[PDB]
Amino acid sequence: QCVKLNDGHFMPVLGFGTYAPPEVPRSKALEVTKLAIEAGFRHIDSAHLYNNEEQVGLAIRSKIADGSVKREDIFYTSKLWSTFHRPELVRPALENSLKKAQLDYVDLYLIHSPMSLKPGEELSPTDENGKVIFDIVDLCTTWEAMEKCKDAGLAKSIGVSNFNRRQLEMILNKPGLKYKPVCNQVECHPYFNRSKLLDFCKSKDIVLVAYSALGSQRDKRWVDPNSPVLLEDPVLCALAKKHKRTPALIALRYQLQRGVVVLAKSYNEQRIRQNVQVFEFQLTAEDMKAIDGLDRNLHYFNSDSFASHPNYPY
């Protein structure tokens, strides 16, 4: 099951999220990405930020080498980190990600976030006062450098992540625009369903890709512990009993039926294999309306520090 992107390429509508906290050994990304491919996942989501592209690339090469899959069957996504927004850094950043993953191309390269940070070796450059150091970059020049990555064939498609409507319009109205973003990867789930942003993206032929669609990893560092737990929600549990499914599968199916490509992270073999059952059932129109009613503008990403960035999207 794929959606056609506005540049003609195809994207599988169910994707495997690979980010795990640094508590988790790097070897685990290799094992679970292999399990995801074996379970039926063909869309694999990574990023420079995740510090796992070598292991994710090893898992793809492993399933190609053993005969399970051809490179053409895999949709591999990586992302440009915010310290590399300056145009001269974009292509070397992609080529470095390609070198780590040991691939000739990525199916999708994204601007990970509109909030530019100080260039350097640190993912989170921090000044003498403990504050993250912002950078000011014309994101239209970042996009122009992204377009040349597609030109050269290092990325089959290019898109963005964590952009709001204002930010998307900035790229769409850029003079001399060569490629529109094929997608906007944003936090999206029943508590924060982005119905207006999704409507805007549909109007522009841009796919909305939902992360944290299962309610996030509730990382102790960011997520508020008193924030509601999505997978324990009463309405999702009622529908899970009605359909003889699980709350996670109801959340995933919800996005598929509203036209949203959905990611799903799991490092647990049984839950990885369970998640591809999203294709085995259908929610009713009344089911969808009940899930729509859960919307409460709750984002699991919470940061006092970035809330002051000029490009903060919320």
Ligand SMILES: NC(=O)c1ccc[n+]([C@@H]2O[C@H](COP(=O)([O-])OP(=O)(O)OC[C@H]3O[C@@H](n4cnc5c(N)ncnc54)[C@H](OP(=O)(O)O)[C@@H]3O)[C@@H](O)[C@H]2O)c1
């Ligand atoms: N562009 C961005 O800024 C951005 C931001 C965040 C995430 N992402 C990407 O989106 C992917 C997913 O987002 P996320 O990190 O917030 O995780 P998620 O997809 O929302 O899942 C959250 C938790 O749900 C659990 N889970 C998975 N399947 C389950 C099932 N069938 N039943 C019960 N629980 C289940 C998982 O725990 P277990 O591992 O124990 O199964 C997982 O930790 C990430 O890996 C990343 O690739 C992108």
Ligand SMILES: COc1ccccc1NC(=O)c1ccccc1OCc1c(C)noc1C
């Ligand atoms: C600004 O975020 C970071 C800056 C430095 C280091 C890390 C991060 N962000 C994350 O590790 C993260 C983790 C879980 C969910 C969501 C997360 O980020 C969401 C996001 C938004 C909103 N805008 O950009 C991003 C990225």
